[PDB]
Amino acid sequence: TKAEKILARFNELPNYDLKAVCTGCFHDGFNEVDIEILNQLGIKIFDNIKETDKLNCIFAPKILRTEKFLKSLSFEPLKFALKPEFIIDMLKQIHSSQININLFDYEINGINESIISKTKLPTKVFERANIRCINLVNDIPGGVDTIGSVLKAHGIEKINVLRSKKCTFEDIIPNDIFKYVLIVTKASQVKKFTKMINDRDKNETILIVEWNWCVESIFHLNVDFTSKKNVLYQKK
Amino acid sequence: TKAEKILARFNELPNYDLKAVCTGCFHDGFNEVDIEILNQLGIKIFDNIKETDKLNCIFAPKILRTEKFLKSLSFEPLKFALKPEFIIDMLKQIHSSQININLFDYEINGINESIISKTKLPTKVFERANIRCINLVNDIPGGVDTIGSVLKAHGIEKINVLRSKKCTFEDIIPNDIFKYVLIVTKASQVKKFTKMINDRDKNETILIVEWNWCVESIFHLNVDFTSKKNVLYQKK
């Protein structure tokens, strides 16, 4: 309606083909007209992530530890990671002919071409890393449900949640290299799991890490097993 | 079949999803079984470029000035530019567990990933440059046929072929910002077309360049109007 009018002034409207979510921006959302204008430029911003929407883009001010940002690094592929100013400056321009904006002026820092291009690979970061099944303490910040959803988007097949305190060796699943992989928060957890596994499956390989180990692996789309950062314990 | 036999030895074969052409390589072609193998890896190598095959990949030993290479820069997008060894090494492994090969070990030397990502844009390079209709001399090496279709793949709408030397102003087309854009071969052509356009359409803008001006624009997926390299004459 009012949008057709605004856009009618334009001749060669680009189709950007962006199927995006946003994080840490656009907190006011968009009015009906801006959504229609965007649609015309082939831009849609989805409120939630759905596999069927074939998302290929994230808007964010910077690298953020959010569920959406982390998952965006599992898009197939991730086409662009852009600052919200791209949308803001484009709309302001249209609201005043032709659109001249350089999409490449708005790339998020630290999300470089080498990383983005890893999303074109046939594998996910944890599949490449041979971490198929993982154990996750249930006391983990953010809630076990969101952590697991992120880890599964990034190639982990089985997320086993361990009851804090209550658990025994039988509750632990192996990884089908490290036979046992655990994500913990407390150093008393590290000792408890080391004892338990050496008692019940002695001489088996173990990797115990904290959440930041995964997060950093995602941010780089590579697990560097030679690194000692965020590794709490390992037996190989 | 026999390829299945060969690959059945493998669990979790990758799906590279490559729709490729090759240039400067695979000159012996592939046998029936290697093609079925590649097929199972999600790799197909087409003999020619067809818009509807939605190609996303080129195999080449290095950056080449072939029609196939130049056009691969107009893929939507170009996902990988890879050395032929990628295919050779992997088929070698296969004919002899699983496939252990790193796609990124085979990136073509001297390709800028930031350049390849411009293929993700909604526009082509000459469309961005507002070079829509050009004039091309007929003695241009490689022939007008191939130069013409390379330019069209990269956003130029009309290619007007000029007969030198029996040539008049009426044989020239304007670019519908430079009103007249000419690709020439010889210094005497530069002088001729300047004289002619100034006489018949005085005080109009003119850009006269060498073929290499277009080739380098394509290699960088950018026409840099600030550079004078490969420019023979301009009046702005």
From Swiss-Prot, chains A, B:
This is Regulator of Ty1 transposition protein 107. Required for resumption of chromosome replication after DNA damage, specifically in S phase. Is recruited to chromatin in the presence of RTT109 and RTT101 in response to stalled replication forks and acts as a scaffold during DNA repair. Residues 10-91, 110-217 form the BRCT domain. It comes from Saccharomyces cerevisiae (strain ATCC 204508 / S288c) (Baker's yeast). Signal peptide: none annotated. Phosphorylated by MEC1. It comes from the Eukaryota. It is found in: Nucleus. Forms a complex with the cullin-RING ligase (CRL) RTT101(MMS1-MMS22). Interacts with MMS22 and RTT101. Interacts with histone H2A; requires H2A to be phosphorylated (gamma-H2A). Interacts with RAD55. Present with 1380 molecules/cell in log phase SD medium.
